[PDB]
Write a protein that binds this DNA or RNA. Structure first.
Ligand SMILES: [Mg+2]
Ligand SMILES: [Mg+2]
Ligand SMILES: [Mg+2]
Ligand SMILES: [Mg+2]
Ligand SMILES: [Mg+2]
Ligand SMILES: [Mg+2]
Ligand SMILES: [Mg+2]
Ligand SMILES: [Mg+2]
Ligand SMILES: [Mg+2]
Ligand SMILES: [Mg+2]
Ligand SMILES: [Mg+2]
Lengths: 138, 125
RNA sequence: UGUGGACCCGCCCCUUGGGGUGUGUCCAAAGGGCUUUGCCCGCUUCCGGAUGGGCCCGCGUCCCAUCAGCUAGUUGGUGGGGUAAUGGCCCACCAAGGCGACGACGGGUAGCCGGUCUGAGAGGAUGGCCGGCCACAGGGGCACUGAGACACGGGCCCCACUCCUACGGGAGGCAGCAGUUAGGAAUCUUCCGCAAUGGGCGCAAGCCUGACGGAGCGACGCCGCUUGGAGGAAGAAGCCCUUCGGGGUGUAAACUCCUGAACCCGGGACGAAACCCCCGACGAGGGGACUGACGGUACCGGGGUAAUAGCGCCGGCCAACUCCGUGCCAGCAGCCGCGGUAAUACGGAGGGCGCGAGCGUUACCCGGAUUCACUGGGCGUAAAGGGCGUGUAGGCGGCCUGGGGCGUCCCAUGUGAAAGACCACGGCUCAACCGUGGGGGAGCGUGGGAUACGCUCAGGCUAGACGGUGGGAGAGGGUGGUGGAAUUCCCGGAGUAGCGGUGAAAUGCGCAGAUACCGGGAGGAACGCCGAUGGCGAAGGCAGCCACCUGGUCCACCCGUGACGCUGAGGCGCGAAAGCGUGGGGAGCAAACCGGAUUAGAUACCCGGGUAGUCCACGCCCUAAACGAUGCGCGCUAGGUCUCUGGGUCUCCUGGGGGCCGAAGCUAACGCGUUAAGCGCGCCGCCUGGGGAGUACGGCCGCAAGGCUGAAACUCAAAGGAAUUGACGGGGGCCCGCACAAGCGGUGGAGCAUGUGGU
RNA sequence: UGAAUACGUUCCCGGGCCUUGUACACACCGCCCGUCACGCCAUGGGAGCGGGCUCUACCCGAAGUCGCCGGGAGCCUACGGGCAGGCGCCGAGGGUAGGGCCCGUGACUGGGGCGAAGUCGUAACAAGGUAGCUGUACCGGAAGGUGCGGCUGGAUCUUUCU
RNA sequence: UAGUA
RNA sequence: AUUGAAAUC
């Protein structure tokens, strides 16, 4: 049926970015929109925007890459190196402010859903809340 | 396995077993000798290797190995056992301790005197 | 006598049996000492406090499902008893209930915790000592007394055991401290003291305390310290090497000065100020005296002797090499492995390395082992995808809005004993040890709050799923029917000597006329060409042609429902071949079997025959290289090419299937690569070195054969996967050489020469 | 002085290049499987004999608490009652009959692991000399061989052993 | 035939 | 004796 929408998305982005595509549709939800803002705000993507495709709501996603590169294999470095579900339908992961992960001594995100709303780790830490630990990007 | 599966079945603990029933753990056990055959080994080796069968205070009757140069052991000798495989002698999982009971020390032994069980000498000493 | 308290009844408040209250009934007591009329130790009733405890509840608490069904006080009721008190705790009567895959019942094992050890952590293992809770006091019942017990040094009965016994009967219980014995690899003194702390009785003095405070024995553990310090040769002797020059032990000894562990003398503790007495008032406060087991010890001063070193190791891993000895012997060995006359691996030497009052060994625990993988693993060929479906429980679940606030997050607060661990600062000359203070924490109760995510409830959507209509291909399945080619048999014609069979043969069949040929008939099984790299099915599997009955599936239209979904333990059903039962049938083929061959033999391969069986009906079995060795579903990620079946606007485009090649990526590799072995989510099933073994036991199923589930002892240091270079093949292709063929001359036979074997 | 013969490369021996399959690497004089025999070890089945736990039925039942009596039948009484004693229920445990179950011994008997140089073959690895494996079914000193169906995890377009 | 590259 | 052996004289 489509068991995890959030993961599907996290993956559509993993997959597209690895053949250096410019854009990617994902079928649209509010919670999906949210994660994308944090993604955009921390400059892992250029951004997103709604659309309609065959009568139906998608969110186009504008990926972003490094500069073309030197020697044999000139493929760019990649702005999103690592994106990964953590809470999952078959095993939900919840953490309190005291146990929030510090992805990659600082250089990394951990998107994280709380009662104050969807938030990065430092956001959440400073707001002092924890929650369902959605995923991590670096 | 899926987590649900792990929740249903768990992982199973690994329990490896004793390489040595000198029963009750016991770092040593008392024997009375029974037979003092001589055994040929295996694999790529040859030599006449000294052995005893031993009735144990465990109720066990087992083949143990007499280390060192010469020995003083026979049908009623009465030994201590420490366990220690031989390797060339399949089914030989224990050692006789030289220097306790009717097992002799080892005469004229100068180097590894503590094993072999042989008191310090008095030559220029 | 009734401050009061108990109980029945009533009323009030409170809310399970808590307070209060009114009548009625019921219930107290003990005396002793004096510094004797005024104190002290006591007594009785009540409410309270403090401390200790009883019972109830939520959650947590090992292994086996080869233990799957358990239960008659059993589950609940009414009323009794019983208790300090709830309750099938016990009893009478009524009812038919309770528990279990979230593992009841059964079997094994175990006192639990603070903590200890290990680990980076998660976790694993553990519960000695010290502290907390439990249980037990030779084994099994029971009660009495009492605030408390169903009582280790109280009682009763039964059992076992030991002792006394006048044979009737009695006595007894170290799992208190010592100590004896027995088992055992192993575990101490029948010690000093009540001086200190604590406990019990006493108004006190005091009496009791193997609690305790000490001493004794164990290097059993941790810490401290000694066996000397500074001089001292181009270097003694001895012992080891030696290319005979020399090298090593080695500043090491000798010997020169120095200090002075041990030992002798002198002095000598803290731990102990209370209770008690005297002043005061039996208070507060003041004063005073008694008391040391450790002990003549610690510590101080004086004197003063150069005064103990062992164990393991030196092949690699792992720090340290040479000579002799020994020859797959004697022996070593944690693992790989050393030893067969030159051994750094064995045994001794010298020397060296490591620890040092220790050093080795065995056992057990965590580790390394991400080798049960939550953190943190896997399944095409390495161990591993269930033979396929159907679907039960369970796990999981699209887009939008709203309510609730169970999951989840945050803040306060309670709990989290002391000891331990940790950081400080002290005290024994240091430390070990010890003390004082500090700092933390999950988990759980309580109050308050958040609502993104998960849950739930209400309503909505249409992208998932399902239906409608119209169209399609198909060896998908079941039933009946029917067609022609071939073999075998029977009848007829014609016709003659063999046929068949092999590498070669023989058995065999044939003059009762076979083989080969023409006609006719009977019967069973299987369907040539079409035919494919094809098609259908969930698998197994499905193939002449016709008809009937019936399943799945694809497309187009975008019409209907409105998440109706995915997976699926167990259950049920299907499941090739062989096999089994009853009854048919039987042409060809053929285990077994009977013969012919071949061979060193030939229970085989080759030949001639041949029963079961192969086919049909009904019923069983339930397995497989049941193979894509690849579970099912969904979403995402270049292309090219061939092909089956649809549709369109028909160079081609858009589906659905079947193949090959290959982007990215993956993989030990070989390979996979929109038909994933990619990137991801959900669910199931499975693995955890090899042999023993798909064996044993057990349970279930089967008429049987047998199937499913499925170990251990013991043993090995491997068993494996893919690729590499070789070598090899009674594998392939291509080449060459007096290699064979084509030739010419010879050895092998004779006599002798020479060399060798042997005698 | 002075020949004969060579078509040709299928065969035998030695060899060169490419490719293939391999369980060989002491490299085919390679590896390797099963019976039989010898020794060591652990183990399954097992008639009887022995010992323990245990469930069900009936019967006997100490101590003790509780219930009833407690009499013209004993003792105390203030006549209310109390005590001695007797009856009962339950009850440690015991007995008989029946089952289920563990331990021990076990005559007789099945295979298994391991052990420097024993015996018969030659199944497997090269097309392993009849491709191999495989479920099943008969058969045979042995390894195996046949039948039926399946899979590629098969190469090819005179006769055994070391 | 056993040990031995 | 033969190679270190087992076998074998
Ligand atoms: Mg040694
Ligand atoms: Mg681990
Ligand atoms: Mg399959
Ligand atoms: Mg299903
Ligand atoms: Mg200090
Ligand atoms: Mg059949
Ligand atoms: Mg039949
Ligand atoms: Mg035949
Ligand atoms: Mg089987
Ligand atoms: Mg050989
Ligand atoms: Mg050898």
């Amino acid at each position: 049926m489509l068991t995890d929408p959030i993961a599907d998305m996290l993956t559509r982005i993993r997959n597209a970015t690895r053949v250096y595509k410019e854009s990617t549709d994902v079928p649209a939800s509010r919670f999906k929109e949210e994660i994308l803002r944090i993604l955009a705000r921390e400059g892992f993507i250029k951004g997103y925007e709604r659309v309609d495709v065959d009568g139906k709501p998608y969110l186009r996603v504008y990926l972003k890459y490094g500069p073309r590169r030197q020697g044999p294999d000139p493929r760019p470095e990649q702005v999103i190196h690592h994106i990964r579900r953590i809470s999952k339908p078959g095993r939900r992961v919840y953490v309190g402010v005291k146990e929030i992960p510090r992805v990659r001594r600082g250089l990394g995100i951990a998107i994280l859903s709380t009662s104050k709303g969807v938030l990065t780790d430092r956001e959440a830490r400073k707001l002092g809340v924890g929650g369902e630990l959605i995923c991590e990007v670096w | 396995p899926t987590i649900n599966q792990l929740v249903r079945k768990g992982r199973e603990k690994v329990r490896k077993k004793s390489k040595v029933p000198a029963l009750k753990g016991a770092p040593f056990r008392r024997g009375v000798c029974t037979v003092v055959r001589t055994v040929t080994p295996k694999k790529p080796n040859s030599a006449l290797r000294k052995v005893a069968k031993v009735r144990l205070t465990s109720g066990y009757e087992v083949t143990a190995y007499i280390p060192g140069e010469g020995h003083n052991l026979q049908e009623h000798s009465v030994v201590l056992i420490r366990g220690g495989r031989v390797k060339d002698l399949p089914g030989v999982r224990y050692h006789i301790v030289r220097g306790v009971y009717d097992a002799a020390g080892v005469k004229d032994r100068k180097k590894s005197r503590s094993k072999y069980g042989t008191k310090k000498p008095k030559e220029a000493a």
